[PDB]
Design a protein around this nucleic acid. Sequence first.
RNA 1: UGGGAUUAUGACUGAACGCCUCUAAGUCAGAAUCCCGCCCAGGCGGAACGAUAGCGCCGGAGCCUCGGUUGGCCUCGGAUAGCCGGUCCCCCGCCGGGGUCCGGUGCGGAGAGCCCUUCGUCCCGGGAAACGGGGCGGCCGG
RNA 2: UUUUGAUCCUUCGAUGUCGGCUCUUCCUAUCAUUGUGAAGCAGAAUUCACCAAGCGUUGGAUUGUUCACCCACUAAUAGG
RNA 3: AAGGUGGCCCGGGGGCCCCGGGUGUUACAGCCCCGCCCCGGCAGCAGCAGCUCGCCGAAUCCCGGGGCC
Lengths: 138, 176, 109, 190, 199
Amino acid sequence: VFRRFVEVGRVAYVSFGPHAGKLVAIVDVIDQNRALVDGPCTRVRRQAMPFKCMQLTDFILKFPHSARQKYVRKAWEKADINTKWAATRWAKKIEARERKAKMTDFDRYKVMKAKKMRNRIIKNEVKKLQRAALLKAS
Amino acid sequence: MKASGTLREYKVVGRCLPTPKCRTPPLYRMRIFAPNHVVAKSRFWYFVSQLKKMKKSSGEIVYCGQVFEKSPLRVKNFGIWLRYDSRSGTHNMYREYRDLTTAGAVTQCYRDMGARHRARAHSIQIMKVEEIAASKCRRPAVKQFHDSKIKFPLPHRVLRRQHKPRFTTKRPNTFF
Amino acid sequence: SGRLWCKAIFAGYKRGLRNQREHTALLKIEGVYARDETEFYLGKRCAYVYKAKNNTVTPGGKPNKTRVIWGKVTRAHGNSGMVRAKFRSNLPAKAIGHRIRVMLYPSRI
Amino acid sequence: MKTILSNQTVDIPENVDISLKGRTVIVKGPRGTLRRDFNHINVELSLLGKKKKRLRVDKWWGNRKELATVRTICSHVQNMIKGVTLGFRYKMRSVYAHFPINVVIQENGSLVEIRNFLGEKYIRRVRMRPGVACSVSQAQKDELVLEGNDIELVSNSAALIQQATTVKNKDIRKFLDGIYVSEKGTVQQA
Amino acid sequence: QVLVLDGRGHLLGRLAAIVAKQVLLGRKVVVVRCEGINISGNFYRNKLKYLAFLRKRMNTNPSRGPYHFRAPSRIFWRTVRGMLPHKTKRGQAALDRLKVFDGIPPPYDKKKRMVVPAALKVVRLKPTRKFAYLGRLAHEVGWKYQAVTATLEEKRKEKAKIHYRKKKQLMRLRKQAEKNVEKKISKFTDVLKTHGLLV
RNA sequence: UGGGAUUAUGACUGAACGCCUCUAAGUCAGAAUCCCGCCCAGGCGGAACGAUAGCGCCGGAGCCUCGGUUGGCCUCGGAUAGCCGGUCCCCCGCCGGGGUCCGGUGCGGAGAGCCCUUCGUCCCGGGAAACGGGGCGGCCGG
RNA sequence: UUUUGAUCCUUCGAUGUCGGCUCUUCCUAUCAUUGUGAAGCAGAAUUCACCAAGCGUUGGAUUGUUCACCCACUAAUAGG
RNA sequence: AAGGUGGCCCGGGGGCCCCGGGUGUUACAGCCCCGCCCCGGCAGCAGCAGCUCGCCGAAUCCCGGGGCC
Ligand SMILES: [Mg+2]
Ligand SMILES: [Mg+2]
Ligand SMILES: [Mg+2]
Ligand SMILES: [Mg+2]
Ligand SMILES: [Mg+2]
Ligand SMILES: [Mg+2]
Ligand SMILES: [Mg+2]
Ligand SMILES: [Mg+2]
Ligand SMILES: [Mg+2]
Ligand SMILES: [Mg+2]
């Protein structure tokens, strides 16, 4: 039950390769397994790129199938995609992933202490709730 | 000739050297697809040898240059004419591929001829390469792509980085 | 007051099909599967432990039964996180499929 | 080659009320219900439109082998509609030369005893499939009538009785005996 | 310290290689639910392959001859022998590390058990291709205990449902608690979101 | 002395090839053949049970011998051309399931994960706890 | 490769050389039996072909004979 | 000129708006080619918009790390 379709104008997130972590629009189709791609505002050159590597989102900035890079830059700024991106939850769990790699040892210790406490509180409240449901039953 | 990596296109010209009979022989140009100027010069000599009274020793090569793609970001539909040797017999072809560059296309031809006919690279001679317009394109695999509102999904998505866990709990999904 | 060493397994010696050159040894370290990754461990002091019947000395303490063979991680091996290592005395083949304690303290930082 | 796309629509009438859990289809109407599993086939079954007027069935990136599975579905669904609304009356006449075939029905048209075939003492206790109603017609001497919704089960049970009454070791070109299908039709016409 | 591999929807050789290499590196593997195993290629030819292996017997005194194990467990074990040097001692101690069960007995029913995706049917075969269950194969070729393992699994399945329900029940109470108290555990969650621990 | 799955073969529905068509996906009947049962032996394979000779249990000291290890994760079931968690005003079952409807979905109700943490001791204050920690008899599950 | 021939690599300080008797297993290129297709197949009788080698394939006169020919029963008196 | 954007006509989906089909040449979307405006003019340049395509260093040098003796 397909929801996202490869349509000229659709935005894709680059999984791996040289241009990792970058957003980019599908300009055109060559064949079954190879497409013309360009992302002017994110510092990615006009180039070929196979569908294998990419994984498409639910945004479709509108432009003609052969439109030269000018009209794309204007349409991109016009829609203001980058901000809606940063609003998406996706990017947030990406930044979390990265902060977790960046995790310092001192922060790691402060975090362990925070966990320890937050979980003792939860344990207390949950046990009172279970006795409460028994009280409700009784 | 092994077609390693991806070909270039080279503009070779050459001639027979002067003689007392004829002081200024005519120049001859070709369009060699080849990885480098060394194998280019060799193949040039083979074709000239097939057509004209001319060897490498009796002559000299005047100029070998690389020739760039003058329109590399436009997409094109190339039309190739062939000449191949079967196990038994020889046969002419006309084949249409859909690529951006002459070199990328010629590569794709080599790989297709290899798949579909087990034709080894040495047997094959390239005789004409013409960029051809969508109107004049005959083959339906090409013809189907000329449509403004092309649309298709990615249905079954085989996983890559299979071994990076090698051992998980959750069975992997492939539907998004 | 905890584990101060990374785990490695003695997979086997350096060898062709019908000849093994046992002066060198192959390690398979836990949780490391690329040549990018193995650049950290370079230079590190490995240490094969074992225990024997009779009582031996122990530096800074009374005599224990435990003994050791010290070694050293020479260079990477292969493309999938295996690693060569050369120990001061040649290893016994009994140890195939056992634990060695790569320490940390020739740091390359 | 890999054909980018095929599809084919079936515009259904308003009487029927289909629904689907993915591939498994369910169809209800007057005569009854009909479920049918397609999990082996691998296609997109979109049920679009108000008044449920049409079914559409996509098939992305198919080769010659995979294109054949579209129209086969279209037809299986259409026959399913016939089976729910109208039904299926399979007529079949008992041909014989000399010895008359004494036929009799057991279990309200579920089972069929067939005696005196070529004067054989063996008797053929043929069992119909579930959801099938055998019946001897009136106003006809040699006439079975098999009624039901599912054409598959009906027709298989027909062939069961047909191949059951088969002449072994004999010239079949001459000995033209046995039951044979004559007229396939429906219970109520349209 | 025990790798517990589920067998369903796995491919016989794709798996067995991965096992053998771990075993040889000391890791204590335990395979389970082998009826789930499914091999590529249609049924009939897989049956031809097996009945050929049965025809191959020692003529003078069959009791000595090659032992044709019918049980799916012992079959998988056999093919592992094939990927091992079973004449040596180190190979025997390997096989001693291995431990196989058909179905799923009590000691292992209480364990979260791992799954190899790199030997999985959905991945490696094209959807159009045909496949065959090892349990069905064995049953037609002699296995005498098909129904029993089924009716024991069903009791396990129901007895599993109840635990899973009580776990969900705990998650509901837990989210509701976190919701009530949040005001006096806001700062801690704040640092967990600074270091990307809670988003 | 009795079964099963099937071969050769005859057949159903049904496209590819607007029709046709045993096949392409799918389905049916089918036999001295094939496998098993009935029958013969019973594994460096297990079983419940009985009897228990100076002895079996029950609760300190040194002192021989074999070595390896150097934190735990206590569980739905299954699908992948679709799933998970919610709710149901509506329909069944002994509270379980079902449909409508709301949230997630390159999985974050994440195994790229979750949990436990050990330097020790002394005073005092501040927050959380007070229905909790730890020390004896009964009640549930296999 | 069950005939026959062509060859000489192995063994001449020795591989016991023809036939019959007895006995096991094995191959299938199916003589008969089981199931089925086709016939210039009405039935009977008889021919050709597919799956199939699990179970059967005789008693005697003459000849050292293997081979050959003949009498008698048979469902059949197939071949290695 | 067209792999046809707005406009026009037919449908199909809603009661002015959305989706298919048909002519057609810029109109509130574009593409293609020739000529003339100091190779039209501006940085930058085999481009850290850390991989659109190469061959090289008398036209090239520096720093660091490991191993063995
Ligand atoms: Mg050897
Ligand atoms: Mg010790
Ligand atoms: Mg049967
Ligand atoms: Mg068959
Ligand atoms: Mg059947
Ligand atoms: Mg000789
Ligand atoms: Mg001798
Ligand atoms: Mg002798
Ligand atoms: Mg045969
Ligand atoms: Mg006859």
